Design an enzyme around this catalytic site. Structure first.
Site, PDB file in Angstrom:
ATOM      1  N   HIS A  62       0.845  -1.196   0.000  1.00 58.97           N
ATOM      2  CA  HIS A  62       0.000   0.000   0.000  1.00 58.97           C
ATOM      3  C   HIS A  62       0.880   1.245   0.000  1.00 58.97           C
ATOM      4  O   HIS A  62       0.503   2.292  -0.526  1.00 58.97           O
ATOM      5  CB  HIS A  62      -0.905   0.002   1.228  1.00 58.97           C
ATOM      6  N   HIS A  92       4.992   6.922   6.990  1.00 57.99           N
ATOM      7  CA  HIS A  92       4.848   6.504   5.605  1.00 57.99           C
ATOM      8  C   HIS A  92       4.356   7.704   4.816  1.00 57.99           C
ATOM      9  O   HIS A  92       4.046   8.744   5.399  1.00 57.99           O
ATOM     10  CB  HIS A  92       3.833   5.365   5.482  1.00 57.99           C
ATOM     11  CG  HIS A  92       2.461   5.730   5.961  1.00 57.99           C
ATOM     12  ND1 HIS A  92       2.079   5.616   7.280  1.00 57.99           N
ATOM     13  CD2 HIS A  92       1.401   6.259   5.306  1.00 57.99           C
ATOM     14  CE1 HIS A  92       0.844   6.063   7.419  1.00 57.99           C
ATOM     15  NE2 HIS A  92       0.409   6.461   6.236  1.00 57.99           N
ATOM     16  N   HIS A  94       2.086   9.137   1.065  1.00 54.67           N
ATOM     17  CA  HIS A  94       1.027   9.026   0.080  1.00 54.67           C
ATOM     18  C   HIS A  94       1.398   9.933  -1.063  1.00 54.67           C
ATOM     19  O   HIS A  94       1.660  11.121  -0.870  1.00 54.67           O
ATOM     20  CB  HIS A  94      -0.342   9.475   0.638  1.00 54.67           C
ATOM     21  CG  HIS A  94      -0.790   8.646   1.817  1.00 54.67           C
ATOM     22  ND1 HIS A  94      -1.192   7.334   1.684  1.00 54.67           N
ATOM     23  CD2 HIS A  94      -0.920   8.948   3.130  1.00 54.67           C
ATOM     24  CE1 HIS A  94      -1.551   6.864   2.867  1.00 54.67           C
ATOM     25  NE2 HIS A  94      -1.394   7.824   3.760  1.00 54.67           N
ATOM     26  N   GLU A 104      -3.521  13.494   0.775  1.00 53.31           N
ATOM     27  CA  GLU A 104      -4.835  13.013   1.172  1.00 53.31           C
ATOM     28  C   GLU A 104      -5.643  14.218   1.619  1.00 53.31           C
ATOM     29  O   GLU A 104      -6.737  14.463   1.109  1.00 53.31           O
ATOM     30  CB  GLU A 104      -4.695  11.980   2.280  1.00 53.31           C
ATOM     31  CG  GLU A 104      -3.891  10.777   1.799  1.00 53.31           C
ATOM     32  CD  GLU A 104      -4.242   9.505   2.529  1.00 53.31           C
ATOM     33  OE1 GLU A 104      -4.105   9.472   3.766  1.00 53.31           O
ATOM     34  OE2 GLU A 104      -4.656   8.539   1.853  1.00 53.31           O
ATOM     35  N   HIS A 117       2.897  10.922   6.851  1.00 52.39           N
ATOM     36  CA  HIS A 117       2.140  10.631   8.064  1.00 52.39           C
ATOM     37  C   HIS A 117       3.046   9.990   9.107  1.00 52.39           C
ATOM     38  O   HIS A 117       3.609   8.918   8.874  1.00 52.39           O
ATOM     39  CB  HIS A 117       0.988   9.674   7.762  1.00 52.39           C
ATOM     40  CG  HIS A 117      -0.116  10.300   6.972  1.00 52.39           C
ATOM     41  ND1 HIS A 117      -1.067   9.562   6.298  1.00 52.39           N
ATOM     42  CD2 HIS A 117      -0.427  11.600   6.762  1.00 52.39           C
ATOM     43  CE1 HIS A 117      -1.913  10.384   5.703  1.00 52.39           C
ATOM     44  NE2 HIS A 117      -1.548  11.625   5.969  1.00 52.39           N
ATOM     45  N   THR A 196      -6.598   6.442   7.316  1.00 55.86           N
ATOM     46  CA  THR A 196      -7.046   6.626   5.934  1.00 55.86           C
ATOM     47  C   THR A 196      -6.911   5.372   5.080  1.00 55.86           C
ATOM     48  O   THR A 196      -7.142   5.410   3.870  1.00 55.86           O
ATOM     49  CB  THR A 196      -6.312   7.787   5.245  1.00 55.86           C
ATOM     50  OG1 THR A 196      -4.937   7.440   5.063  1.00 55.86           O
ATOM     51  CG2 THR A 196      -6.415   9.059   6.088  1.00 55.86           C
TER      52      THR A 196
HETATM   53 ZN   LIG Z   1      -1.180   7.598   5.821  1.00 47.91          ZN
END
Ligand SMILES: [Zn+2]
Length: 258
Positions: A62, A92, A94, A104, A117, A196
């Site tokens: 992911h 991590h 995104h 996000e 994050h 999320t």
């Molecule tokens: Zn995240």
């Protein structure tokens, strides 16, 4: 078959396996800077990462996560809208397929190239697993990334991505200092939300920093070379691993600055 960010298993499909996806305090959300309320009672954030001990970096299909030793209060977050001490467990990102998307959370509908994050859990609950079952169990620090000048402190991370290209791969990642990922100012916005990614539990107190950090095109480009798939399978580039903004509903976003 399971959740992901594809056309057939993307965010729009998550509610079938995780009903809470349509909950009352889901994240991310769009931060309307003119509707956010300045709260004078909000204390400055206290970030103590001087004793942080990173352990490993892994590709879980992911995103890629950098994990820390959370057996003691080595790297903690206190203050702000928080009550108690929160220990850093992992961080991590995104990101998008293009520089115009990837974050996000959005600010006045503006999307950033990526979002970092830093996940922390409330020590009162003993462990991460117990913490996610509580409304005040986690505290995630969100930092926006914009494309511009390179961020020296991020280079050690980008250089090891080649070793964890596919899902399941992990590698030793010691002596990484997360303080090199923080912007100059710690001004922030905060609201009650959720994780999320599935299980999408509503146990997070979001702290989103106002000031983004800059990274170079070359650095974010390396993020885009990772794979969603495991080794020995059709290559699917790990890009656009972000969830779209969710309804704010009955929630108020507070700001630590005017
Ligand atoms: Zn995240």
């Amino acid at each position: 078959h399971h959740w992901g960010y594809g056309k057939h298993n993307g965010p729009e499909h998550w509610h079938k396996d995780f009903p809470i996806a349509k909950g009352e305090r889901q994240s991310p959300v769009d931060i309307d800077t003119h509707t956010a309320k300045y709260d004078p009672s909000l204390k400055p954030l206290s970030v103590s990462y001087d004793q942080a001990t990173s352990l490993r970096i892994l590709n879980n299909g992911h995103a890629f996560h950098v994990e820390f030793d959370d057996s003691q209060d080595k790297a903690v977050l206190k203050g702000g809208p928080l009550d108690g001490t929160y220990r850093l467990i992992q961080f991590h990102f995104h990101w998008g397929s293009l520089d115009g998307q990837g974050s996000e959370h959005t600010v006045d509908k503006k999307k950033y190239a990526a979002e970092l994050h830093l996940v922390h859990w409330n020590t009162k609950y003993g462990d991460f697993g117990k913490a996610v079952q509580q409304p005040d169990g986690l505290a995630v620090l969100g930092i926006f990334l914009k494309v511009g000048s390179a961020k020296p402190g991020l280079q050690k991370v980008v250089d090891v991505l080649d070793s964890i290209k596919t899902k399941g791969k992990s590698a030793d990642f010691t002596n990484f200092d997360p303080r090199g990922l923080l912007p100059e100012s710690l001004d922030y916005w905060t609201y009650p939300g959720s994780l999320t990614t599935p299980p999408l539990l509503e146990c997070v107190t979001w702290i989103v920093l106002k000031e983004p950090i800059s990274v170079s095109s070359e650095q974010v480009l390396k993020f885009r070379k990772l794979n969603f798939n495991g080794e020995g399978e059709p290559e699917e580039l790990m890009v656009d691993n972000w969830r779209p903004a969710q309804p704010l509903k009955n929630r108020q976003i507070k700001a630590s600055f005017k």
